[PDB]
Each structure stands twice: as C-alpha cells, then as structure tokens.
Design a protein around this nucleic acid. Sequence first.
RNA 1: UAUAUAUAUAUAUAUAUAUAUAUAUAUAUAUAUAUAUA
RNA 2: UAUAUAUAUAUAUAUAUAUAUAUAUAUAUAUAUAUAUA
Lengths: 1273, 50
Amino acid sequence: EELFNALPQPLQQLSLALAGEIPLTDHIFEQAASTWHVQPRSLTYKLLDHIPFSTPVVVPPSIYHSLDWSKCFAVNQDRVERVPTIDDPDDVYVPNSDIGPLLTSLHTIPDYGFLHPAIENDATTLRAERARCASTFYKIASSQARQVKLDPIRMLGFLLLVQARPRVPSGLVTDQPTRRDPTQSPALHAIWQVMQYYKVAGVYYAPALVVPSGAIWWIPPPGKRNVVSVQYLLTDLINLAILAHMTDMSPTLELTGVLMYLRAASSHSHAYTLLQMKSVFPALSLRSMYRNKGFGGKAPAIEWTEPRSKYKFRWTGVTQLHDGLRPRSPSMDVPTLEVLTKYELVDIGHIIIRERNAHPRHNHDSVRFVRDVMALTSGMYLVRQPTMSVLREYSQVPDIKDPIPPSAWTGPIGNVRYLLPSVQGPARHLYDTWRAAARQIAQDPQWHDPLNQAIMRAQYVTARGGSSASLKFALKVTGIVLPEYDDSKVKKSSKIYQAAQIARIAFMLLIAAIHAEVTMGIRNQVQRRARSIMPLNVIQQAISAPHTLVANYINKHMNLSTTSGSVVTDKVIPLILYASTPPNTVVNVDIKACDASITYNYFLSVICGAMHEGFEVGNADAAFMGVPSTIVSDRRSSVAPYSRPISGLQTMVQHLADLYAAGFRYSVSDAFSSGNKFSFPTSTFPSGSTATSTEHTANNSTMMEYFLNVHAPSHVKSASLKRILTDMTIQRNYVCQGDDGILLLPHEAASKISADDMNELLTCLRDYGQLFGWNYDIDWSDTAEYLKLYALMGCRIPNTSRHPPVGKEYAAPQTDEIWPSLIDIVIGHHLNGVTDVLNWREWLRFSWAFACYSSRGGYTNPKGQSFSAQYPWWTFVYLGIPPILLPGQTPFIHSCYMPPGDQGMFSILNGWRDWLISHASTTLPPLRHNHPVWGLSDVPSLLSQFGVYAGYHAAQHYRRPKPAPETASSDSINQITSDLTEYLFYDSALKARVMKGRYNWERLSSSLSLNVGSRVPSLFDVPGKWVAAGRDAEKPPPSSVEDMFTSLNRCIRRPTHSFSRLLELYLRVHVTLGESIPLAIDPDVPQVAGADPANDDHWFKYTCLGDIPSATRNYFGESLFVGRVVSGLDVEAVDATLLRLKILGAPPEAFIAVLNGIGMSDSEAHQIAGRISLANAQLVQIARVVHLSIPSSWMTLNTGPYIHHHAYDFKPGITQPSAKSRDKSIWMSPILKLLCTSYAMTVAGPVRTSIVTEIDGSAAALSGNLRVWMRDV
Amino acid sequence: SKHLSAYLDSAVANGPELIVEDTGLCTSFMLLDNIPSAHLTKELIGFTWF
RNA sequence: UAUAUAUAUAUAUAUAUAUAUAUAUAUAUAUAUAUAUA
RNA sequence: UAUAUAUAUAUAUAUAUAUAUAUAUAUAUAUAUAUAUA
C-alpha cells in the first residue's frame, strides 16, 4: 500500500501500533501527536492522490453555481430576515452562495480570509442594511461549518491512518477480517473528485478551516469562487465514509448515500433540501420489510407481568414466524418513490428496494441490512438564524373545530370562571379530571412539612438561568432595591444570583414582577428543527407550583406517569421490544406540537377553573408558600354578588390564570444576527426542560382516555372494531411522555385486525384531535418509535445517524472551551460507539487515533507566555478505553465492556500478573525486602518504565481551571452565603436541626476518634456548593489556566510508584475464569442489530447474559433509604457513609447526628437508622461503599443473576482456605463478586464463570485493612 | 415455515372444483358430414337441394 | 368550464403465459490446483 | 502416469428467484371523441 509509504515516519509507526503490529509506547505516542499539530491540514487531502479509485461516481459541476446572497436577505421592521427564495415559507436556512467577496486576508496565514472590518463596523455603527445582511450571512454560514467536535480533516486523517494497514488477526476463531476494502468506497472517491476543484499548484487548499471563534475561508482567485455548501458536503461525505466503514456496509448502499448528498448539494439551500427528504431512508427500509410471501424466522417471546404498572417483563422463549404473522400495514414504497421523483432520484429507491427484496426472512442479515441503510441519513447538526426560527415556530396558533361557547361559563370569580354542569364532551372530562386531582392536592399535610418546602425552594436554583435583567428592572420599577454581590465573581443571569437577591423580601411584594419578560435560547438538532429553552425567573417558577403539583399527582396516580419517573431510561427498552413482537399490534402517535397547541383560550382556562374550584375544599384562610389568603369578589349570582376569602393556592391560580391569559412575553437577543433584538408575546408554552413534560403528559393521557372510552365507541362503525375497542384502557394499553406516545392493541385472537378497521380507527382519531386543535401525526407501520428508540420484531435497531462521528452542537458563535475538555469529548464519543453496536475491533482502532491527537495541547497568555503539556497514553486506559496490545500479550483480547477506573486497572493487571512477575525477575535485580503481592521480582519499577503510574495519576488531575477568591468579595461571599442560607432556611426548625446535628457529629467523630475531617454531607454546605457552582460558571482568568498547566506537568513529572490504597489491596486477589455460563436465549434470535457472529464480542456478551433487565430479586439497589432529599447533596454519598458507619459498628447516636445533619427529625432519624442493616442491602448497594459501581456500558445487560449465582467468591474445591472470608463474608462477598465479574467482563469472548482462587494475604488481613481505610475516609 | 404456515391456516383454497355449469346441449355425439354432396349445374339438375 | 358514463390511444402498477439474461441449489461431464495411495 | 478425496472454474440438464422484452386480463392516470347534467 503506497499510501502507507506516503505517511511520515511517526504516523507510520502509529499505524503499525494501531494495526496491532507492536505494543504502543509513550515515545511514538508523542511523535505522532506532535507532528499532527505542526503540519498543515491540507496534506491530509494530499494523501488522497495515492488511492486508485474504481467506483462509478461523477461529481457534476452543478455544485459550483453560487446563488447570490444579496437576494437571500433583507431587513424590515428593523430585523434581518431570510426572505425565502421558493414560495415555501420554510426555506429559512443557509443559502448556497459564494462567500468570497466578503473576505479580507489574514496577516498570519495570507491565503485564508475573514470578514471585512469595514463591513462589521458599518453594520455596527451605521446599521447599514447591506452591511448587516452581509454580517448576518457570514456569521451563520461560519456557525454552520462550526457544528463539529473538531476539524473534519483531522477525522479524515484518522480514518486514513487506521485504514492504511489491515489489522493483525487474533487467535480467536471468530475474528473475521474486514470484508470491505478501500478503492471501493464511493465516498472517498467523491471527496477526491470534488476536491480536485480546490487545487492551484497541487496544494489542495481546504475550502474552510474551523477555529475557536468559528471558521475562516480561503480567498478564491479571480477565476474560481467557493460556495459555502461545498464545505458542508465534505463534512457529510467524511462522516458517511467513517460510518460506512465502521458499520461495514456494502459499497452499493454508500453509493446511494453519495448520490443522495450530491443531489442535495447541487440545489440551493443544501440544508433545506436535505431536510425536505429526510425520512426517505427509514420509510424505504424500516417501515416496509416483510411484505412478501417467503416470510419466516425466529422471534422473541416476551411476556408482560400482571402488575403492568410496574413495567416488568419476562423473556419466555421464542416464537416461530410464518406468513400469518407478517406485517399487515401497507408498505411505504409508493409515497417515497413519488417524493423521490421530484428530485429525480428514483434510481436510489429502485436500488434500495431491489436490495431489500433479498431479505425475505427475519434474521441477523435482515436487521443488519436495516441498520446499515438507516445509517445513511445525513448526520449534520442543522442551524438557521434564530430570528427566523423563533418567528417561524411561535407564529402558530391551534385551530379549534368546536370552541367552548361563551355561554358555557358561570359568572367570574375575579379572574376565573367555573364550567357549567350542563356542558359535556371532552372538555367536561378534562375539567373533572383536573378538578379531582386538585381536590386530592388540596388536603395534603405532605406539604407544610418544612423539609418538603425546602425541597421545592431548592429545586428552583441551578447554575444556569436567565431573565435576570427583566427581574432587576421590574423590581427596581416597583421601588424595590435589590442587593448586589458583583465582587463575588458570579454571573448575574444565573438563577442562583437572582435567588440570593430575593431571600429577604416579603413574597407578596414581588407579585407585580411575575408579569415580566423572559429571555430565550436555542439548541440545534440533528434531524429536526432546533429546540427551545425558555427559563422562567425564580418568582414565576415559584408561582406555577400548583400547576406542577397537580400534574405530578395526575401522572403518579394515573398510568404511573407513563415512565416519566425516568428512574432508569432502560425501562423503555423491554417495553418497545414487547410492543414490536408479532402477537401485538402497535401504533406510534405524538402531538404535532404540544408546546404550541396548549393554550389559554381552550385548554388553560379550563385547567385554571378546575384547579381553582378543586381547591375550594380546604381552609379558606391558609397561606401557602408565603402567599396569604385574600378577599375576592364572587359574581356567580347576578342577584346576590359578594366577596369571600380564598386560600393562598387559589390566589396563586388567580395570578397564574392572569399570566396565561396575558400570554408569555419573550425577548430575543440572537448573537449570530446583527443588532436586531426585540420582544414579542406568544401563547407558546415555555417547555424548556423536563418540568413541562408533566403537564403535557397529563393532558396527553386525559384526552386519549376520553377518546378510547367515550368518543370512539359512539362514533366508529365497524362492529368488530367496537368489540375489540371495548375492554381496553390506558393503564394497560397506552403510554406517553410529553408529546410522544405509544398505543398497543389487545392481542387479536391468533389473528390481526383488518387494515380497513385500522384506517377507520386512525381516521377517527385524527378528527378527534382536530376537534380541540391537536394534530395527532399518527402512523401505523408495525414498528416501535418511543423516545428515539427503534425496535423491529423484538430486536432493537440503533439509529446511528443520530450520533454522527464528526458532528457536535455549538449554540454560540464561539466554542468557548479549553483544550483539556477535548479528552472528555473523546471519552463520550467512544462510548456511543459501544452503546450503538459498531464493529468493536475497528471502532477501537479509530478511537485510539482520536485519543492520540487529543492527548496534546497548549495555551498562550493574552500577552505573555505560552504553555504546553500532553498525557501519557495510559491515562485513556484509566478513563475507560481498552488497550489494543500489551507487551507480551496478543492484540485484541480486551473487550469494550471493560469497566473504567480502578476496576479496569485491576482486571488488566490480574490477567497480566504472571508475565509481569516473571519478566521483571529476568530483567531487573530483586527489590530489597519482601512485598505483599509481588515476590522480590520488583514489577513496580517495570510499570514505571512503562509509565503506568504517570498515566494513572495524570487521569486523576482536574481539567477545568479554578476561579480565585477575594476578601471584600468574601463579604459578598458571606452576603451571598447568608442570603442563600436565608432562602434555604426560611423557617427556624431546619436550622436548629442541622446545627444540632453538626455539633453532635464533630463532637462524636473526634471524641469517639473515628476520624477528623470527614466531609459528611450536610445542609450547611449546600449553599457552599451552590456558590462554587455559580463562580465556576464564569470564564476563568488566564492565571488559573497557567496554574493548571504547571500543576498538571508537575503531577506528570513527580516520580510515584503506588496506586490508590484500594487498588493496592485489590491486587491481592487472584481471580480465574471457568467455562461459559449457560446461554440466556437462542443465539439464532437477533436482539440488537449488528450484535451478530460478525461482530462477535457484542454477540457473545448479549447472548450469554440476555438484554432484558430482569432483576426479579435484586432490584439493582434503587431502594435507597432516604427517598426524600434536598438538591445539591448526593444520595450515593449519604448511603455510602451510612453503610460505612454500620460496618464500622458506630453507636446509634452517630447515625442520629448524621441523619439530623440533613434535616431529618429525631423521630424519623431513629426510624431511618433502624432500617439500616447488612441483610436487606443489595450487592451493588453495599459494594458502592468502596466506590465499586456498575459501568454505564452494562446498563443494557441482565447482569443481576450472574453476579448473584455465577461469581463464586468461595468455591470449596478450588479456593485456597487462606481466602476464606469467614464471618465478615456478609459484607466481604459482594466486594469479591464485583471484582470477579469486572474481570470476567474485561476479556473478550463468551462470558465465563468467575472464581476467586487465592488472596496472597489472608482474607482477614484484607478485611482489616479495608476497615482501616473505611475508618480513615 | 412453509409447513408451519400450511398447517396453521386452512384458508388456502385448493378445493376441488365442484360447480361447473353448462348452458349448451347435453350431448356428446355430433352428426357429421363426412363426404360432401356434389354440386350439379349442367346435367342431373334438381336431384339435390341445399 | 366542471362532473358522470361509454369508446379509442398512450403511460404506470399488478396477475398469467412465452422468450432472453443474471444469481442460487442439485446432478452429470471436462479442465486446473492440493492431499493420499500405487 | 493411473486411482480416490477435497476445492475452484467452465459446459450441459433440472428447479427456484430476480430483471428485461412480447402477448393477454384487471386497476389507476393522461389525452381525444360521443352522450347526459350543471
């Protein structure tokens, strides 16, 4: 491969290491990283010359047809709009224009350019129209290019490097070498052809270059001109090329994707063109697979347990597939082909359909094909001008087909109107439901509990926030002089900052401020319009409390919130799998825009009236959250009007209804556009975070229930449909979360419902939603779409396109981040490639290349010095990336499921133990006195020679700079503290409780001499945590950066030869692997697409353990003792301390002090303390006391039973008696089991039984040291 | 899958074709002119008539 | 100008029959390579 | 060189599937003509 010869020497070495030829070393690790940072990026394109492509792809010159930008922008009413070219009002995206004329030249790199300083000045100072339009166009065009985790060229360099040389085979019988090869990929050939336009003297000038402040462009010569779309096309091509290789797809499918992108790029508005024909691929493949005759195969047999509210499922065998079970819904070929005819891409459909017809039976190949084809959709984070986005989304109002007549209301109650009893229909149903819930909320001593009140107030504060300026204005307007703490370096717009200002003020004085402006933000998306973030101010968030509370009660006490408890997201996995099984018919539904359709004229007025009436049952004089009862005029009786008191809850409703009727008033201040901030109101619900899911899920459930039980039976025609539609209820037939929803039909007896009845049913539902202005957007394709998860016949399909390898969202014109953060990006990037099942061997190779580039970085003072550093590669091992090849071992023996942290280290060393010991003896002189785990052979020196300690400690170092304090600012720190504590401790009982607990605790901890300095979670530190978070949200000063680099280097250079005490002790255990465990399911049945004999290790791991989490006796430790806690503190810290105390045998008052330290009253403290026992605790619950946790990668596997009865901590016939844990086994055995299973999961291949065989020291010695360490911390 | 699909659904038609109906003539023997009669136009006129 | 019905022509889709091409499976013959025996 | 076994390729025959062409039937769309209604 001449390309391998083209690489420079260090990169050739790195490629050899990645191929598994040689063990990786820090030396070559640096040489590769360094040289990448010094050579120009264009050379990566230069590498493409040495690929003899043989693919049938032609790049039409139609691409280079820049449409003039001047006609794509205009300003009216002093705002820069997009003025769409086509008559479609949605063409509001970046056009296809030549950016060239707007460029100057840089002094550093003369070839590339940036915006004219003249243009931006005139747009800023003169507000000149054309200047502003040019600026806006330049800003957004640059931003669209910036939507990548790093420069795409670097990723392309990674792909070439790994693909430059075939990987060496391992000894495994399932290690199939790659079937795909270069010179056959249409993507790379396409990149070659298109890039031929950008060379002048064989130099291959990149069309653009991304920088921290955005992206720069190259000035074209007089002959040529660069269209911004080309850059986007390159990114899509590179992303597709990487994905195709990792997914190992046929070149034909990649060919179709290339043609797909080219056609989109040829026309104007590359983004808009792609967006229009988005769903073509899933419709062609996923929605229509088995609509033929030769159907068959094996399918999972999943059963839903009787208490369906618990969402518990059981795998109970397999089911043979046959024609009677084949999908009933019509295919999707006709509409898709009709759409494709518009863009004359019918060939793509013909190719896809013909290829699809080669999979008549459901098996691994079929789903693998589906996974690959669905991976063809564009992975670009689309971005448009926020001004257009806000103008296009919130300009919608629902259309009600039968409005509530005005005569249907009673007389006013000051603001609200009650609903007349004579009114029926869905509105009546909605009214009663909310009213009933309001009644239940009304009398509930759960509130007025001071602890619960603390939870609600604390829930309102986060590091982020907004609308602070509106807050300061509104209160200053009403004569309220708020405090300030600027010297305490914390952002004013933080929700924390405004909360501190409010602490002292009597609440009712603030009531006028709730009718104030709210700022807004935008977050871009991959396959849809960008999302919206609308953070209310703290006061508004407080007022809306009743709305949330009632919604919560509706959810938690009707359909159990339809999984909106979100305890572990994986509970939806078995649900959709069950929903997609052949015996069941499922329908996917979701509100078209629930945020935009909920409104006051129809919905909120009804809810407000119901809540206000529902609160009538209760003491009319009972203040709630500092809101006192007031007098309101009642005008229900025209003959006898009067005024009566109303409780604080009702007063809240009175104002809340007023606000909703007035409509939200937003203020847009987009930065990408130029000087165009303004404010306009809308009825669109905020819906900026999970706090909105409760309301929409409640209304979603309510309307669905009424439709099923009342509207549909009264209106449908088919008698058979009526027969099956009856005996159906939401609690066992429907789930939802926000707009999203799933509806599944009762099992038709050995049969399926007529599509005719389905059409009748679906039609009526659409009309039902049309009544009150909900577009239901339903579909029926015998698949499962819920929370962006896809299941087909009980097999999960990872939609990889939603996690593009290169793409990353950036919501601001500047990246605003520092170099070390890139490491965390790499770690998160790699995990997705594990969550989604890719070719695990090749994905690992690519990951290391990414890591190598990220391993190095530098910084420069605003005026002064530069700084630099880089990590030894062992860091990434500690961070959770398996090594490819260790010295003395064979490559590719470590599975991706290897746990991060100490566990991964221990497992690696445990396997590597014997070779290290023997090799150290030959190579080095013995150490001077005996070692606990090692002999005299002195492996630690060898590890230092490998730089293991350097990497091990380097990964421990922090990666974000720290802000500095000040003393007059500390007066503000105290002022900030005092007020935060004041806001937290509204009453006095909590303060007395915490103070008593803290005083007793330190007294006990010192006098009993457990230890001193134990940072125990307590409420007094919660404000401190808030303050630190608030100060951290600020951009750090350069001095902090310099401290980081210096500290990091010193930590790297310091010669240390010891791990943490825990890892040192963990090495004392010897673990061995026996035979394979009995299988969970039939290996024939596919469960996750791509986890097949080709991708062996995933296929092994899933097959052995089974995917369905089925903790019938374990419950994965979710039964934490402290169900109710305040924000800021960590439950996982609290229970760990409690168990640690219990193991240490502390006296009960120690528990009492600790519990009282977090607000628990003495009585409940005793009650809680009594529950603490080593028996009822779960394996993971107790094992976490020493930070032994379950890796996130395991959350999709049924590891419970294995850990329970497959990891033998003491097998009688194998273990040495020295390792017998004896009585301490009650808390020793879980630790050993966790270590054992971690090692077993580390190695590749099938899961084997794990057995402790020996502890070098006695088990007693191990337990004693552990108790010491537990007492120390 | 063929056998399983066959054994599970009996609505595969393939029933014997019982109903066949005739509206013509219930006969199976045809009277046939084997040797045509000669046409006479000069001598023996009138001995045959068509 | 629109709607409905009938007839004719063209295009697309589905089914049946015939011909051609490609792929897969089975059987027979020939050639090449590898292994074993003489 | 002969025999046996395995693999690959070619040729022939049979069967299945896909694609293209021709013929017949059905459905949809477009155009033209006739009739009826507005």
